[PDB]
Amino acid sequence: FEKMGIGGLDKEFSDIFRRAFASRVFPPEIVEQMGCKHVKGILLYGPPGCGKTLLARQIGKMLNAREPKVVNGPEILNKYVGESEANIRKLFADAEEEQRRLGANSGLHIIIFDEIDAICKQRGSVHDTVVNQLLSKIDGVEQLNNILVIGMTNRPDLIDEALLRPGRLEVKMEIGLPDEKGRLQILHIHTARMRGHQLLSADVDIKELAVETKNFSGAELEGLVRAAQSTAMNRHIKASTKVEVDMEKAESLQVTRGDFLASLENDIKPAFGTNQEDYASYIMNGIIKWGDPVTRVLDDGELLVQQTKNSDRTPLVSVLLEGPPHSGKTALAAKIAEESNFPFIKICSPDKMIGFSETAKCQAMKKIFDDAYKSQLSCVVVDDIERLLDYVPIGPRFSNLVLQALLVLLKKAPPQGRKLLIIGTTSRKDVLQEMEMLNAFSTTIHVPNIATGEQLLEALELLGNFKDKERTTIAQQVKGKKVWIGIKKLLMLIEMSLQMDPEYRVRKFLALLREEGASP
Amino acid sequence: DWNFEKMGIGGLDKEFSDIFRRAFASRVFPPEIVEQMGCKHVKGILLYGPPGCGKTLLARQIGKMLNAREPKVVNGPEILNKYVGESEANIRKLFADAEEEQRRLGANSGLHIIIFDEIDAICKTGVHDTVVNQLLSKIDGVEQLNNILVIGMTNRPDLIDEALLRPGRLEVKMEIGLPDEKGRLQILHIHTARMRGHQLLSADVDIKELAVETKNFSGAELEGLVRAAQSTAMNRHIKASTKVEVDMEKAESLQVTRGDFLASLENDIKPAFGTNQEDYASYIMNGIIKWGDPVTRVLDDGELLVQQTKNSDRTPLVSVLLEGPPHSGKTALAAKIAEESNFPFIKICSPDKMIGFSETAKCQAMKKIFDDAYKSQLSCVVVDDIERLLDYVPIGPRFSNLVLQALLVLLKKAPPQGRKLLIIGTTSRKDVLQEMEMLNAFSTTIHVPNIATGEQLLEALELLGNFKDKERTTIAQQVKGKKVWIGIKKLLMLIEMSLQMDPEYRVRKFLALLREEGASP
Amino acid sequence: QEDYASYIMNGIIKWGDPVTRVLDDGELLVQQTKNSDRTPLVSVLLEGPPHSGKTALAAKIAEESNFPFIKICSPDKMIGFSETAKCQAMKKIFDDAYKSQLSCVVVDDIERLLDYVPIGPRFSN
Numbered sequence A: 001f002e003k004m005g006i007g008g009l010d011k012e013f014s015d016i017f018r019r020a021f022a023s024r025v026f027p028p029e030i031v032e033q034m035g036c037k038h039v040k041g042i043l044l045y046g047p048p049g050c051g052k053t054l055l056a057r058q059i060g061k062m063l064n065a066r067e068p069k070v071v072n073g074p075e076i077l078n079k080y081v082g083e084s085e086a087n088i089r090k091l092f093a094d095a096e097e098e099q100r101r102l103g104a105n106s107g108l109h110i111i112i113f114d115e116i117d118a119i120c121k122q123r124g125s126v127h128d129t130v131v132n133q134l135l136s137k138i139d140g141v142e143q144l145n146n147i148l149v150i151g152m153t154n155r156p157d158l159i160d161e162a163l164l165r166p167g168r169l170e171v172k173m174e175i176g177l178p179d180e181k182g183r184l185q186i187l188h189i190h191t192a193r194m195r196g197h198q199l200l201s202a203d204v205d206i207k208e209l210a211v212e213t214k215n216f217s218g219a220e221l222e223g224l225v226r227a228a229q230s231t232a233m234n235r236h237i238k239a240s241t242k243v244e245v246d247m248e249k250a251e252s253l254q255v256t257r258g259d260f261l262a263s264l265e266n267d268i269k270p271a272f273g274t275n276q277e278d279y280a281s282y283i284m285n286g287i288i289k290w291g292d293p294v295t296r297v298l299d300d301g302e303l304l305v306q307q308t309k310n311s312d313r314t315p316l317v318s319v320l321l322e323g324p325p326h327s328g329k330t331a332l333a334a335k336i337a338e339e340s341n342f343p344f345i346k347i348c349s350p351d352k353m354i355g356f357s358e359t360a361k362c363q364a365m366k367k368i369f370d371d372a373y374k375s376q377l378s379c380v381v382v383d384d385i386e387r388l389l390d391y392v393p394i395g396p397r398f399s400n401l402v403l404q405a406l407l408v409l410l411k412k413a414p415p416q417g418r419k420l421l422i423i424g425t426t427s428r429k430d431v432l433q434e435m436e437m438l439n440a441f442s443t444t445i446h447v448p449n450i451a452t453g454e455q456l457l458e459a460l461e462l463l464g465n466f467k468d469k470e471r472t473t474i475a476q477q478v479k480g481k482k483v484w485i486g487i488k489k490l491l492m493l494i495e496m497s498l499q500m501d502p503e504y505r506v507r508k509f510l511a512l513l514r515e516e517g518a519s520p
Numbered sequence B: 001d002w003n004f005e006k007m008g009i010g011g012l013d014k015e016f017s018d019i020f021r022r023a024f025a026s027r028v029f030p031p032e033i034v035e036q037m038g039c040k041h042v043k044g045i046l047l048y049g050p051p052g053c054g055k056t057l058l059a060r061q062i063g064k065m066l067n068a069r070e071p072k073v074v075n076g077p078e079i080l081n082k083y084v085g086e087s088e089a090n091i092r093k094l095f096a097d098a099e100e101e102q103r104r105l106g107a108n109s110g111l112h113i114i115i116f117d118e119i120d121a122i123c124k125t126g127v128h129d130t131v132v133n134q135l136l137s138k139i140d141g142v143e144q145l146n147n148i149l150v151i152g153m154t155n156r157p158d159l160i161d162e163a164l165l166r167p168g169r170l171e172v173k174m175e176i177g178l179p180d181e182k183g184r185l186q187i188l189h190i191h192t193a194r195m196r197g198h199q200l201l202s203a204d205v206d207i208k209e210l211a212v213e214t215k216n217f218s219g220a221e222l223e224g225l226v227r228a229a230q231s232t233a234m235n236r237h238i239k240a241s242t243k244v245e246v247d248m249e250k251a252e253s254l255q256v257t258r259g260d261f262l263a264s265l266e267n268d269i270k271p272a273f274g275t276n277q278e279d280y281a282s283y284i285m286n287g288i289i290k291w292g293d294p295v296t297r298v299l300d301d302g303e304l305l306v307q308q309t310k311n312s313d314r315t316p317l318v319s320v321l322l323e324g325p326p327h328s329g330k331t332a333l334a335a336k337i338a339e340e341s342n343f344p345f346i347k348i349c350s351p352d353k354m355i356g357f358s359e360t361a362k363c364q365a366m367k368k369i370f371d372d373a374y375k376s377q378l379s380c381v382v383v384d385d386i387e388r389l390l391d392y393v394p395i396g397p398r399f400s401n402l403v404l405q406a407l408l409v410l411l412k413k414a415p416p417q418g419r420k421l422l423i424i425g426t427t428s429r430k431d432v433l434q435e436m437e438m439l440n441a442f443s444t445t446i447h448v449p450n451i452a453t454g455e456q457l458l459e460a461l462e463l464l465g466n467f468k469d470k471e472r473t474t475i476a477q478q479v480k481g482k483k484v485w486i487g488i489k490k491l492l493m494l495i496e497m498s499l500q501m502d503p504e505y506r507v508r509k510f511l512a513l514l515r516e517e518g519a520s521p
Numbered sequence C: 001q002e003d004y005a006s007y008i009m010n011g012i013i014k015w016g017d018p019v020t021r022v023l024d025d026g027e028l029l030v031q032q033t034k035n036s037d038r039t040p041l042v043s044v045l046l047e048g049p050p051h052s053g054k055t056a057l058a059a060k061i062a063e064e065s066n067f068p069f070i071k072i073c074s075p076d077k078m079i080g081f082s083e084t085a086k087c088q089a090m091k092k093i094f095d096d097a098y099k100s101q102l103s104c105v106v107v108d109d110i111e112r113l114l115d116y117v118p119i120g121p122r123f124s125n
């Protein structure tokens, strides 16, 4: 990476050079005396968009190798019986034909294979013949000494065992997310062109931009720069169409300047970063304090967050919130997850799986947990543990496969020294206990309802929407009667009651409240 | 001109503004501005949309507008030839002028505009893929070009090959949306300017009335309607059709009467989609009669809840349930409430259209309906006979789980952004729904009562219209001093059945049938 | 070597006699299976109250056996599998122990493999 200039995988490339390229830098006479052979392939897996192609391009260029070739995943698979092995054989055919002309002078024809998962046969849950031909061409009755295979993937656990035996693809490597220095380096390579012509502004602080970004991948920063320049062009056009003063201010306005900040929070939506639209959808009207239970729940959540942050013996921590229906459990869980300031946070709600079968839901949950396993910190929030299972009181009836997928994923530990936090939300804890799911968790929390008349009056006053005389009359009417109302139901009832003529407003609200239940 | 209406087309103005912003903005600035830092010159445009929505005219008018050479237009897959290599030679022949201009005039080269009619035909086995690769190499190969513009038009956007959709080859994609009411007004105005010029049109035709009546029409459909009305008007002159032809030339005086247009549109053209009719007269038939107080209360409650969902802020989702005993007239009331709502998007999902579909098909259809409702700004959807939507049988009991789960999840999914919604459901087995734990999802419920008192029965019978004072008095002699329990639909069926006897036995048969149907809860 | 390190985390604590008794029984079983000739196949079942450390003891015994072939068949590697896939995987894992002079296969969490659930009951036949 000294010659490449691009930074981010210097240690990885040094290690890979040691692993394989050590044989390419040595007295050739001792190399001949070696009597050994060279490798036949390698593998590279990691998060998407981490520049797994630039690595191959630069490494191939470094050793003065022939032109590379790129093959995508869904480039071979076809429904026809005999139209899959054709491309696999064709790719090796060109190397085979030229082997005769040189024989011993043949140079390495470095190539790139992308998304090996497409042809791999490991879908136990793509045919089972393409990989046989691939392995045979890689090695068979005849051995080819002028080939090399470089692969790419994001699901390393789905590759077949036969494709990693010592005869072929006997090495592996991983590509990880960069840190602040990596983001600084990336921002120094996708923006130097603007600096060359003095388009950038001195006010743009690269360190501030790097600090603001948390888990941006390689493509995210380039996209942010592109959007920032687009916004600068839009501002320039707005100024031009607004008023004409100089006719040379266009060049000065072409400067990106401080639009990077706006582009950060408006033009880029990282997949591994925090999401604001989920908060907007779930915590809609905002948290309004009306009692001590909210404070108790928040304190417990903060304590659990601290415990998971500062633990070494227990990398896995799981909590569970429960309460009566319409008590507002989702919002509190969303708030707790948000206020953790973790890098990775996702919500696996069931509203995104309308009409799916059991297998699709299992795959979705597995994918979400696999993504969570990557970052150095994670906080997954399972929304409804009673709608994923498809539970109906009649019967009873439910799905066993999802139950198992959940029961096994609440005890697995991350790899090496990574962390994780699993939050849950339910309303029928009794059936969960009946199903033996109540012991897999580590702690339980409660969320009570508005139960006291004074609490209801205080909550209504905080919400306002009623005048002094009306509120006093309401307080007079409630007296010592029983109160068992829900927050969501409370808001809905208030809104419905406030929809008629001003003369009859308290009357209808009181009638609806009384008609409702008054006991657990 | 930038009016976008000086041409012979209209309806899509915002898209015209967007294409003007994104296409010709760079060219307007002098070359000094471009040379300062350069720009991504665009040489790719694709157009699509509902079939026959005026896509072809946009390309022609855009080509005529720009001050450049005449664009080349190819009518579909005319490139293919019997021999080998002819297709590649033909496709190469198109770019010769561009290469010559790039070589000679360099940067200061006149723009080249290329029209591809039915690009989907050629781009989507050896010949076809070779031609596709040749096009891909020519458009973006070793030597770049910046004096070419290629525009393709299709009606199947999902068939265009992925390799051709990458940036740098097809950068601007346009969808031709349905014309609005103002677009329809403009279409009608420009489709009859000739007659007004010669003032041969009858004053009985109100263009605004046609615009209001017409809904979900393409421009070609409007033109066909106009021509069908023209033919209907012309028929009035010709007289002989079975014998040798003879025409009433002397009559002349050609006029376009409203009756001709109405008759033509009645049985000549019908829109492919957007036909929300034939159900507002099918589900609600025989009208709504005021046989007692309850109907007024139900209608008032429906109107109040509709108003609530109209102008609320923190309640973007409202649901109602109309329960009651069978044959009580539930579907008719729901249809009437929906009609009186008067919303942009309305649709009724009923099982009559899913006779034989399995669980997955029902789930997919419901999801499609609800997504369509999601799209528009605000809408009200209704569902009828839930117990039939999820096949239910008392024995066992037996039912389906996929449909129940899909329905349960879809009554609490907030609509995108600030849009609104309204859901109304119907059923007659409230107990089962409550036991399934679905009644807690619905927000409020209403009751639809039966005909209980004899006075109500007499009022309904008089309002419907039948029997007479003497027969009515005889009926009241026995029915007034008692209690009754019957539904309106059953009452209509019984009246119709008993009306088929002899004059002196109708009343006795009706009373016997009423005694047969007598019961109570 | 990674399996033993992963399944055993905080080592073994000698907090009583039962640990020694269990380890002695395991050693006796290992000796019997290595020496005898009329009983080439042996089996043993470990059970107890939940959260008592059974898998750890099984792994420790297996590592102390000093056999040439050792393997562990856990369920967490089979998330989302169907019944046929599980049967094929288990058969493959077992069929690799017939091609060596000695073997020791550990099957753990049987109740999870069979897909048990108190309601019903339900499981894979």
Ligand SMILES: Nc1ncnc2c1ncn2[C@@H]1O[C@H](COP(=O)(O)OP(=O)(O)OP(=O)(O)O)[C@@H](O)[C@H]1O
Pocket (backbone or CB within 6 Å): A282, A283, A284, A285, A286, A287, A288, A289, A290, A294, A325, A326, A327, A328, A329, A330, A331, A332, A427, A487, A488, B412
């Ligand atoms: N102090 C509060 N605690 C909880 N929720 C509150 C509070 N103040 C306001 N809310 C509102 O409560 C709503 C959260 O309830 P939510 O819609 O998530 O119900 P829920 O508990 O998931 O119920 P169910 O799953 O039965 O529908 C949010 O709209 C939030 O605005």
Ligand SMILES: Nc1ncnc2c1ncn2[C@@H]1O[C@H](COP(=O)(O)OP(=O)(O)OP(=O)(O)O)[C@@H](O)[C@H]1O
Pocket (backbone or CB within 6 Å): B009, B010, B011, B051, B052, B053, B054, B055, B056, B057, B178, B179, B183, B187, B218, B219, B220, B223
């Ligand atoms: N939205 C519209 N506004 C105005 N006129 C329209 C519209 N849609 C269609 N038309 C009319 O349609 C007629 C021709 O339509 P169109 O351009 O689709 O024809 P075409 O070339 O046969 O189409 P296609 O390529 O889809 O087969 C023109 O008279 C045009 O006035």
Ligand SMILES: Nc1ncnc2c1ncn2[C@@H]1O[C@H](COP(=O)(O)OP(=O)(O)OP(=O)(O)O)[C@@H](O)[C@H]1O
Pocket (backbone or CB within 6 Å): B283, B284, B285, B286, B287, B288, B289, B290, B291, B295, B326, B327, B328, B329, B330, B331, B332, B333, B428, B488, B489
């Ligand atoms: N005020 C009214 N309300 C309802 N129906 C009325 C009224 N006046 C007359 N009718 C007649 O009663 C009919 C009721 O039939 P409808 O199919 O709507 O009942 P329904 O309860 O849906 O039947 P089912 O539930 O068994 O399908 C109306 O279609 C109409 O013919």
Ligand SMILES: Nc1ncnc2c1ncn2[C@@H]1O[C@H](COP(=O)(O)OP(=O)(O)OP(=O)(O)O)[C@@H](O)[C@H]1O
Pocket (backbone or CB within 6 Å): C007, C008, C009, C010, C011, C012, C013, C014, C015, C019, C050, C051, C052, C053, C054, C055, C056, C057, C109
């Ligand atoms: N003497 C011991 N016997 C057993 N486990 C011990 C002993 N000393 C320490 N441990 C700890 O026991 C833990 C292993 O117990 P583990 O939770 O796997 O038990 P289990 O019975 O297999 O559980 P599960 O029922 O959840 O499958 C390891 O962390 C190890 O540190």
Ligand SMILES: Nc1ncnc2c1ncn2[C@@H]1O[C@H](COP(=O)(O)OP(=O)(O)O)[C@@H](O)[C@H]1O
Pocket (backbone or CB within 6 Å): A006, A007, A008, A009, A047, A048, A049, A050, A051, A052, A053, A054, A186, A189, A217, A218, A219
């Ligand atoms: N470590 C890195 N340093 C500089 N640029 C990077 C890096 N990783 C990714 N990029 C940028 O991301 C863009 C696309 O990366 P790509 O090769 O698609 O990643 P992947 O191999 O994961 O698909 C490239 O143009 C490259 O400039």
